[PDB]
């Protein structure tokens, strides 16, 4: 909607999509042992 | 035409021979195993109401581990 | 950010005379957090009109190859010095001047000698015996290695992304190296 | 034969010498003197060494195989990327102990029919990566069945455009393409940048196919990879789309005579004398 | 990236896609 | 393995678990026959 709130993830892409692909397939495969889950914001809209 | 020299190939060590031990090499036939009331003074804890007829004897004989 | 990325810049070595390893160009950004649509749209539309000229700065300058930052660059791809070859005019006839010191005239000091017309002129190589392999210059190292703008980054499967980015890797043994 | 897991078995594991075992013919032609090169080198030994390769000859020496059949397999699991190279002498030894374990004439047969399968699977590995095909054809089709076979607009720009598509990963053996989630990609190379996103440029490009500021920056950089593989009458010459394939293609033409054109420039900058530092910034203002 | 995954059988053991980021706040 | 502890005025014991798979796999071919093989590694011992 504004591109510093896409920016800064207030609104926007989850962190399955604006993340780089790779990144995403590295912490499904690493999850129970080394969380990124909690490194990256999602916007959640209304 | 050279000689055929056929391949020398081993018996399996697993074979039928066998009388495979788990912690050694694989002895095959014809050895011999001993129960020998001796050794199950070495392991005590299983006999305390045993005589020298009815008796738990140990076969192993492994000098690494122990007694028991 | 993967439609417009920015730059991975390359960071060069000068002994090695490689490249040592790709970083994006965090240091050359332009700050529109506090624009508006008037403008965030069109510094984004100067992001990727740079792209675009590294693209084709690339396409222009860079030599075609596979692995990007090789380790050992051939001899034919290497800019070699080339020189003209070297004239030399040789002083004094040598046989000339055994034969009139053997009649007993003392030559000292020094066409050049007055009893010699003779005059022998030597033209040797230059350049090296062997052509020079191995490792780029500061100005090879300009020519190539344009910036790498690389679209979408690392979507792809593990081992296709660009690992020669990092300067810690390896090519001919695929890990990144450690203290020992 | 650089790359043959049995040709590599035999440099590390049969003797780098003539044995009368291996080389039978090739010592009895030595003993016997009927060599081309060097007849009499034979008579020219000592008893020790003369008498005992004689002795090899007339009865030779049984050996086995086992050894050279299993190193001949575990070389080519290393070749194959199914073992890691550290895993070499693991590996070896643990097929060692099993066809020890388990050793019969049918195990030593089903070795010998097992190193001429792994010769195959080798080689087949090898043709598979220069043509470059099976993993990209088997995950373009499956993108091309999420991507609707019928635009309204444009089908003749549509239809040649995906067939082009097929062209890249075809007449392009390192270029692949694979999913990642939701969407499909495009490397142009392995281990290399430009990858495009197919499930996000397709969804830029419909909607685009008949038009005649508004395109994604991997739909331009889509365009610009298909660019050498469509002709000018593979799309129209009107359509927005097909007005940007000609002038990528003239765009990818004007950067290979300006790449022969930068070769030129400063060659003849050097041998003319001027600054290094200057001739080489001046010479892409003239072409950039 | 299975090489990383444990494995459970033969399959790796694989997380979801979707949860890869967090979004809590102090209510919302 | 060397171990320290606490002194103590009485016989303790020390009781180290180390750790296996120890592991049994039934096999009934036939209507009345249970066979079972029993495998445990490190500290091996069974029909395996």
Known sequence: ??????????????????????????????????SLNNKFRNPTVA | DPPFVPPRYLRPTGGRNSIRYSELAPLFDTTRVYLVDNKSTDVASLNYQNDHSNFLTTVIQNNDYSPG | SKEIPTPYMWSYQP?????????????????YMSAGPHMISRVNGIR??????????????????????????????????????????????????????????????????????????????????????GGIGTLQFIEEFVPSVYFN????????????????FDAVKDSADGYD | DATDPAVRAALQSQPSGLNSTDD????????????????????????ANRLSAILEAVVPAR???????????????????????????????????????????????????????????????????????????????????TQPANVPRGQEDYTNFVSALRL??????????????????????????????????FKNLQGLWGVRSLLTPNSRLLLLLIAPFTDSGSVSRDTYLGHLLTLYREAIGQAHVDEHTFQEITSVSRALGQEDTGSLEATLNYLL | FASLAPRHGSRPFMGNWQDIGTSNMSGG | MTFEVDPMDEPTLLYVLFEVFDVVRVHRPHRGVIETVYLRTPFSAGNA
């Open chain 4, 63 to 145: 050996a086995n195989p086992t050894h050279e059949k299993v190193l001949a397999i575990v070389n080519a699991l290393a070749e194959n990327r199914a073992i890691r190279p550290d895993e070499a002498g693991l590996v070896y030894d643990a097929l060692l102990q099993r066809v020890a374990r388990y050793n019969s004439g049918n195990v030593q047969t089903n070795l010998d029919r097992l190193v001429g399968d792994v010769r195959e699977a080798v080689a087949q590995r090898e043709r598979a990566q220069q043509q470059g095909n099976l993993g990209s054809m088997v995950a373009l089709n499956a993108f091309l069945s």
């Open chain 3, 153 to 168: 980054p690392f979507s792809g499967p593990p081992g296709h992304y660009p690992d020669q980015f990092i300067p810690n």
């Open chain 4, 168 to 201: 890249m990963v075809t007449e392009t053996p390192q270029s692949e393409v694979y999913q990642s989630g939701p969407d499909y990609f495009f490397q142009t190379s392995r281990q290399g940048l430009q990858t495009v996103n197919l499930s996000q440029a």
């Open chain 4, 24 to 47: 039978w013919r090739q010592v009895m032609d030595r003993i016997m003197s009927l060599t081309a090169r060097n007849p009499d080198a034979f008579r020219q030994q000592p008893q």
């Open chain 3, 48 to 133: 990727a009109h740079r792209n675009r000229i590294l693209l084709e700065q690339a396409a222009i300058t860079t030599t075609p190859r596979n692995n990007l930052n090789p380790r050992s660059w051939p001899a034919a791809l290497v800019y070699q010095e080339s020189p003209a070859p070297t004239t030399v005019v040789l002083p004094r006839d040598a046989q000339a001047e055994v034969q009139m010191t053997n009649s007993g005239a003392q030559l000292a000091g020094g066409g050049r000698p007055s009893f010699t017309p003779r005059q022998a002129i030597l033209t040797l190589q230059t350049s090296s015996s062997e052509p020079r392999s």
């Open chain 3, 15 to 31: 002994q090695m005379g490689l490249a040592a390893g790709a970083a994006q160009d965090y240091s050359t950004r332009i700050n």
């Open chain 1, 1 to 34: 909607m504004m591109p510093q709130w896409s920016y800064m993830h207030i609104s926007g892409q989850d962190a399955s999509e604006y993340l780089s692909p790779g990144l995403v397939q590295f912490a499904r495969a690493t999850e129970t042992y080394f």
